[PDB]
């Protein structure tokens, strides 16, 4: 009641003659000669009454027991009613089934600025063959930014995972592509492969940058509403909303500044939005922020100095300084340059455009004379009042601008003794 | 013709500015017998300064120089007076500033808000104060209560005024410090350098800078086969220091794990509690490899993975099995004339259950006209008493088979056995 043993390969076509067992039954045992009782998987192996042990088909040893060492089948046979024996048939594995990959390729996503060291488990393959003939190494198309760690399992199954070697950046490289191979371990080691698409996702890692921290532009007073002041710009390399800068004024900034100026948020054009006045205020300073729409925003800023320019938008003004500012008087015997009154040569506008000169109408007994702050009305000749009591002067005064402006203070002058 | 004078501001009680009548005489002016020696024609803001019939020049108010002329290096009253008759005379009063206005912030509190992840050299502008004093009596500098992480840069503008600007001197981290409170104060250039102050509230806002750390990389806990639904395999943990949403982790499997894996195992996505969810079986499959990811709900996230190995435990749930190895399933034949060890048939003792739970003993029924003889993998039905066909043509035998497990499982197979002649 003793055993036998026989090796046959797999994937070997039908009827392939494994052993003549009638001759072997002699060589250490007893002597239809044989009757068959029990064989596992008779799909594979039939016997013959001649003692001939033949195969029935191509064996898919990989199918019925993938990735395992020694996979045999056995059977029991009886002599001419005599004692029995066990034949065991191990099915040696061929390197026929090469590495598979389920998908043809796989996409994966990684946030930029993931650390150097980060890992990603990705395992996928199939090499149904067992032992040395199974899977043994995966490997990437070698590069200086992405490496690989095979981690060897307790079974034997070589799993792998994707290490991130060097520091990452989306503004530089926004996607990578690699070829990922998977190898066998047969004398002619076979291998399929797959493409690997990496996609480097946008971290809001830059913040708005201004060209210079201070801008210094000139604009004219009483300007039209919606006239330009400056188109600002803040730069962001980041994707979409993580790079979509938006602009704003920030402080109270003199509540003037709020309603003297408008701002387009999406594009950074500071517009006029009110009656600018030199003679209200001669310079403006506006604090402008600009942040991205992303998360962890760090707004950048600037200051914009608007030097507002004087236009000649105010006439002159002539005030007469006395009791009764519509009329005055002096003597018949009034001497050389009796100062009868002072007057104000007064203008609001800056410098050039508010420098007043003033004559006196026509040929007249009264002259006029200037000093720094005001003007001295001083007589030139004398009235023999004898004939004529009064005569009502007007005083002419034009500023020195363009287009220049005027005004005139008419008043009276009788004479006494 | 010309006279220059000087008063301080905020001087009540009509203080005596000068005696123009004396100073006109010292320079040389009209000796009018007539009484209003000087006649006042013009004066900018008479509200402040009233002259006198007898040539005095007295004041009329606590003058506020900072009101009418804030932040400006000159603020003059000028007034003109004609002689008794003949000549004119311009009088000037330069009002000197004194430090009666200290700096002032608009509130008593400034709440700002920085993000973590803001680099060193990042800046923020900030309003400043209101010192309507003039010259150095105005604001000259600002200061933060000094520290190692924040500082200030004051920039001095063309106007003369000083503008402060909050710079971020060193690398920030919420997880270690989430709030700073500082004192922002603003100084004069006064003889007593007067100085008001205000609170600053930096508030470091959470960036999603951390990604879950798993307690280990490979977890390995064992569960019984046929174990019922919701019997827990392992409670997992991964840790995020970050705030709220950016902190809140969720747990799940990732790959085509094994279509079975998901059929057998749940996982609560909030807690990291992998429960059971199916008829888990040893004789189906003895170990699994569940691949768990945990990522934080929040911006520019990085996930974190681990591998839990669940060893399934063979319990004695599958029976023994007794397969007779003859062509006829239920009966067997043999001659009455047998030689005391005629092997009539074979039988399969067999059990799925691994190791000890499926190693099977097996016996006959009672009294033994025949006998069974266990070998490796199968047994052999030999004979014993070699009996007569004339008395008993047939017997109805039964085999027993009990495994070496607890609770111990047994089954049986009985059959007939007629006898012939040869
Ligand atoms: Ca095959
Ligand atoms: Ca093979
Ligand atoms: Ca292979
Ligand atoms: Ca980047
Ligand atoms: Ca950005
Ligand atoms: Ca980016
Ligand atoms: Ca104007
Ligand atoms: Ca003007
Ligand atoms: Ca003018
Ligand atoms: Ca004052
Ligand atoms: Ca003052
Ligand atoms: Ca002050
Ligand atoms: Ca941190
Ligand atoms: Ca987090
Ligand atoms: Ca954080
Ligand atoms: Ca079972
Ligand atoms: Ca079991
Ligand atoms: Ca059992
Ligand atoms: Na723009
Ligand atoms: Na947990």
Residue numbers in the entry:
A (entry chain A): 1 to 31, 37 to 422
B (entry chain B): 2 to 423
Give the text the authors published on this PDB structure.
One of the Pcdh19 EC3-4 molecules was used to solve the Pcdh19 EC1-4 structure (3.59 Å), which contains two molecules in the asymmetric unit, each starting from Val one to Asp 422 (RMSD of 1.4 Å). The EC1 repeat has a disulfide bond at the E-F loop, typical of clustered protocadherins, as well as one of two α-helices (at the B-C loop) also found in structures of clustered protocadherins. The three linker regions of Pcdh19 (EC1-2, EC2-3, EC3-4) have canonical cadherin calcium-binding sites. There are 51 PCDH19-FE missense mutations (out of 70) that can be mapped to 43 locations in the Pcdh19 EC1-4 structure. Pcdh19 EC1-4 crystals were grown from the putative dimer SEC peak elution, and two plausible adhesive interfaces are observed in our Pcdh19 EC1-4 structure. The first one, which we will refer to as Pcdh19-I1, arises from contacts between the two Pcdh19 EC1-4 molecules in the asymmetric unit, and involves a fully-overlapped antiparallel dimer in which EC1 from one molecule interacts with EC4 from the other (EC1:EC4), EC2 with EC3 (EC2:EC3), EC3 with EC2 (EC3:EC2), and EC4 with EC1 (EC4:EC1). Analysis of the Pcdh19-I1 antiparallel interface with the Protein Interfaces, Surfaces and Assemblies (PISA) server and with the NOXclass classifier revealed a large interface (~1650 Å2), that is unlikely to be a crystal packing artifact (89.21% biological, 81% obligate). The Pcdh19-I1 interface involves extended and mostly symmetric, in-register contacts between repeats EC2:EC3 that account for ~58% of the interfacial area, as well as smaller, separate EC1:EC4 contacts (~350 Å2 × 2) that are slightly off-register. Taken together, our crystallographic structural analyses and binding assays including PCDH19-FE mutations strongly support a model in which fully overlapped EC1-4 domains (Pcdh19-I1 interface) form the functional adhesive unit of Pcdh19. The antiparallel Pcdh19-I1 dimer interface validated above reveals a homophilic 'forearm handshake' binding mechanism for PCDH19, involving overlap of 4 ECs from each protomer wrapping around each other.
Protocadherin-19 (PCDH19) is a member of the non-clustered δ2-protocadherin subfamily that is located on the X-chromosome. Mutations in PCDH19 cause an X-linked, female-limited form of infant-onset epilepsy (PCDH19 female epilepsy, PCDH19-FE; OMIM 300088) that is associated with intellectual disability, as well as compulsive or aggressive behavior and autistic features. However, PCDH19 along with the rest of the non-classical cadherins lack these critical tryptophan residues and must mediate adhesion by an alternative mechanism. Here we present crystals structures of the highly homologous zebrafish Protocadherin-19 (Pcdh19) encompassing repeats EC1-4 and EC3-4.
